[PDB]
Design a protein around this ligand. Sequence first.
Ligand SMILES: Nc1ncnc2c1ncn2[C@@H]1O[C@H](COP(=O)(O)OP(=O)(O)OP(=O)(O)O)[C@@H](O)[C@H]1O
Ligand SMILES: Nc1ncnc2c1ncn2[C@@H]1O[C@H](COP(=O)(O)OP(=O)(O)OP(=O)(O)O)[C@@H](O)[C@H]1O
Lengths: 570, 551
Amino acid sequence: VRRLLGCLGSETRRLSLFLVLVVLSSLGEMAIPFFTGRLTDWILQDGSADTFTRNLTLMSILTIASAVLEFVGDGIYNNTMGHVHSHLQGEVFGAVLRQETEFFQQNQTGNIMSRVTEDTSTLSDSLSENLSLFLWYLVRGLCLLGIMLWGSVSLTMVTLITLPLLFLLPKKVGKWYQLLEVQVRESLAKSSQVAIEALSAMPTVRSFANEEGEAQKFREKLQEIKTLNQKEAVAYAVNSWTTSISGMLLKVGILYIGGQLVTSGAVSSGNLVTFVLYQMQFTQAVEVLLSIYPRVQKAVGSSEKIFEYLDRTPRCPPSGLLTPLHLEGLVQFQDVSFAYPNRPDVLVLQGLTFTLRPGEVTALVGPNGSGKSTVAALLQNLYQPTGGQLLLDGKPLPQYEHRYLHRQVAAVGQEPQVFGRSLQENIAYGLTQKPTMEEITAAAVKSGAHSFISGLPQGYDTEVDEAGSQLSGGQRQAVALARALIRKPCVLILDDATSALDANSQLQVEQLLYESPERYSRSVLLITQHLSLVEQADHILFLEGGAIREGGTHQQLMEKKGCYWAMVQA
Amino acid sequence: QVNNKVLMWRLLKLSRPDLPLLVAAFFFLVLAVLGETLIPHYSGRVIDILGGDFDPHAFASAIFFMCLFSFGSSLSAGCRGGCFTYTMSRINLRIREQLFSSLLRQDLGFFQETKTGELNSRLSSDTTLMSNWLPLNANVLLRSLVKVVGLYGFMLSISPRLTLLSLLHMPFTIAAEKVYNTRHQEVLREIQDAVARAGQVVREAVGGLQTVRSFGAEEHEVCRYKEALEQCRQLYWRRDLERALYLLVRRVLHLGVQMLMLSCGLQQMQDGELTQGSLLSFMIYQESVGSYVQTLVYIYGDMLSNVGAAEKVFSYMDRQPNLPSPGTLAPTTLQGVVKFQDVSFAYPNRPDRPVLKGLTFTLRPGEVTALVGPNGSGKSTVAALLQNLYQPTGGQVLLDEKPISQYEHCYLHSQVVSVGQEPVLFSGSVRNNIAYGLQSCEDDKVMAAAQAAHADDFIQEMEHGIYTDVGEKGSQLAAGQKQRLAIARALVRDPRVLILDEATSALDVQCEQALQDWNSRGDRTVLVIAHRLQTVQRAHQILVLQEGKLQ
Ligand SMILES: Nc1ncnc2c1ncn2[C@@H]1O[C@H](COP(=O)(O)OP(=O)(O)OP(=O)(O)O)[C@@H](O)[C@H]1O
Ligand SMILES: Nc1ncnc2c1ncn2[C@@H]1O[C@H](COP(=O)(O)OP(=O)(O)OP(=O)(O)O)[C@@H](O)[C@H]1O
């Protein structure tokens, strides 16, 4: 379509040079038969030898130049094709990565977007060379037609007239063979189906000892397909015979009409020899074009799939432009109600309203489910609220710049992922500026991960494989905490970061939450199952069914004697 | 690597009974090649005739011979193609039938272990590849060899000096091809490694997207992907440059040999030992000869590469069944005394986990023996062991003071029959499924069996009576109708030992019991399986089986 020309237009300076080289090489590669005919005619006229050596040198020079020009043009085309293929791959990946989280939560189809991009590889090659093979040949054919027409218009007119009669008749004949093949395939499928049906009930076919019956019923099916096979063979034989004789008789016809022309005196024998040598190459070029065309047709037909991912509209608000240099970190919820866009019939959150202020720790507690992690997912702008408002320092989340907002708010999830790279890169993941070693050591000390980092033989540069199989759960929790603590965030979410951790890590977290000197510039939302950390929190929020029922400090909730009291007693 | 050699020997032995077709196809191929290769020689003769003084008779004769040879070559080519396609189809049919017949004799454990889809894939796909393997490769090899021999014979006929000049070309081409392939293999390995490394980053980024979006590191992954794509593109360009250089050197060599041959031929024609038509025919032959010798030198690898799609089916045919040798006891004295002595069974698919713990009981001809127990106790296993579908791991079974495995396979199942727990129906008609496993029968016996099983009430509602067609896997009748049909199918044979694994049945088996005491006739041993003790209560002998132990 027009999109291929649009993405190929950035190089229409090199493509013109490639086309010029191609036409020059095609012109120069055909001097061999012409000079053969000329030199043979000169021998028959017993001429001189200076013209002989001159013509030999000229033909050699022309052929050498043709080969060199073909090589140079092929190199230029390959270089440009590789460049545009790399650009297209980068563009399609960048377009895929911009879609909203609702597109990516279908992890059961995750490999699809791990495959479609790779499809853009195997498609592009299927279009990279075939389009060359077409383009390298058609002009070549057009070159040959430019010489035989100069030789004698009658013979080239004859071969042009009878070319379709030899290159379309087998196509018309092959329909019979193809339909017979389809019938044979369907009969074989039916026989295989009845064989599978017989085989799937082995206990009940052995209980009556009827294996001979199944053998007979399977032979009976093949006895019918034998006749279809015979008809298939006859049709194939007829197709082969016609596709042979139609192409073979053209040479005899050309020789007859050329002999008539030569006896008439219009042309000489050398022209006939050159025409005979040119006709085979012309036929080969035409056959190559006919073979090439369906493949490029299939490629351009299948190219429409990639553009679907390329221009898919994201269902998410655009990034804002706000980037203040001073954030207090106050977070307000105003009657927030959220339903998952995958199944928007269920309201997971309803009537949520609370305020987080710097220097104060808010502990969110509740049973399994009940949208505990959904509030954390909403807080870091991973989803948009169906109803209500989320306010950060008096401004909504989408109004902020994407990178700045995600730098100012940090979260530790239930199951932290660790990518495969150096260990000190995982600590500073996503940072715009590479931090110093002192900052990474300070972050490791704050999270307590520095105890076992120095025990590694490679230190902070220990490579990690995929999925973090080289580390235990507690080490992964420590590295995730240190990664979330490196940027000094304004709003810290710790959701299930105290589940499978060491006691030393628990002590480090407890010290960071309450007795750390830098807590005053931080607002913490803590989700945990340990009552010791919960009791020291300033505000406690109980979540059940996506609604807030019990709220206040620990003493007030103890005096309430409600759900939190039962949880404490349990 | 002798596995491929023995596989190809097996394929040749399988295709052995198609000798005349292959011989005729080879003869037609030789005729077609010989007829085709004469065309440029007669073209050269015509060209030589046209020069100099004219002679219409020679011209007409040459054109007539050209037409005749073209007609003969086309006819032979068509016949060869037809013969090869027919032998393809014959090989396919023979191998399909052989595989099915071999698979039909396996033990039950093999079918329990394997899957129906895998068997369908092996039967319906690999046989076509086996059929296509031999005649296609044979045609290619024979065509290449005959073409090479004929073309070089014609070179020798025209002029030997130019033939030697042409033959001087090959070794440089062979060496260049080998060197290019050796470098290309390493380049391809590097390409594969680089593309795997490039795909790793996109897989990792698309996996954990929530953590990526949490930290806003979306453009970083794009930059890393671009960095990987740069190395991939560099390796691609290096590979393309190597290929272009190889093509250039091949073209230069071909040009050199062509120019040398043309110069030598012109020098020879100047001396008077050649003619214009002979030179033209020699050029045509020289153009034609190269691809055939290339195919000839690559055909061994091409043929050996495709054999690796037929070893699975040969292994399936070569699998040894785990069954005892059949007996040869077919007596007419089969009053129906059945004994189980210390029978303990373990499933071969899941060994060392026995379900039977030393059963021992006796059956009687005229009386009724019922077996009761809870779900999962394993009464169906007792029925299967009584039907000689499995062998006991301990103790023995006796049928009229003879082991059951020493009876004839066809005779035993005509006397000891069983209505199964879940009846299975086939795609045949009602009459075909009622008389399943029977070579011949009469309509009266089928009608009597339908009346005895209380299945004749609904047998007249459908068209054509008992000859009514049934859907695939019996997907046309109700569950009660299927149960009645199965009961009639069992009762057709008029057995002596009758097992009725009712268990989960909804045919109001109270009617079956009220029919005639669970089909007991006083000379036929009956073993009826029931879920609850209260459902039968009239059996002369009652056995309760708990956890593989009798009570
Ligand atoms: N993508 C989704 N689409 C629809 N519903 C979802 C989706 N992800 C989670 N849920 C459901 O929404 C609720 C969110 O619960 P949430 O994950 O916050 O609970 P939790 O207490 O943190 O722990 P857990 O994950 O063990 O339930 C659950 O009922 C969950 O099954
Ligand atoms: N093909 C098999 N391979 C391995 N183990 C099997 C197989 N079929 C059944 N079993 C197991 O062997 C025992 C036989 O159970 P079986 O089905 O015969 O019980 P049953 O008492 O006849 O009752 P019902 O069939 O109505 O459930 C069970 O423990 C079952 O799980």
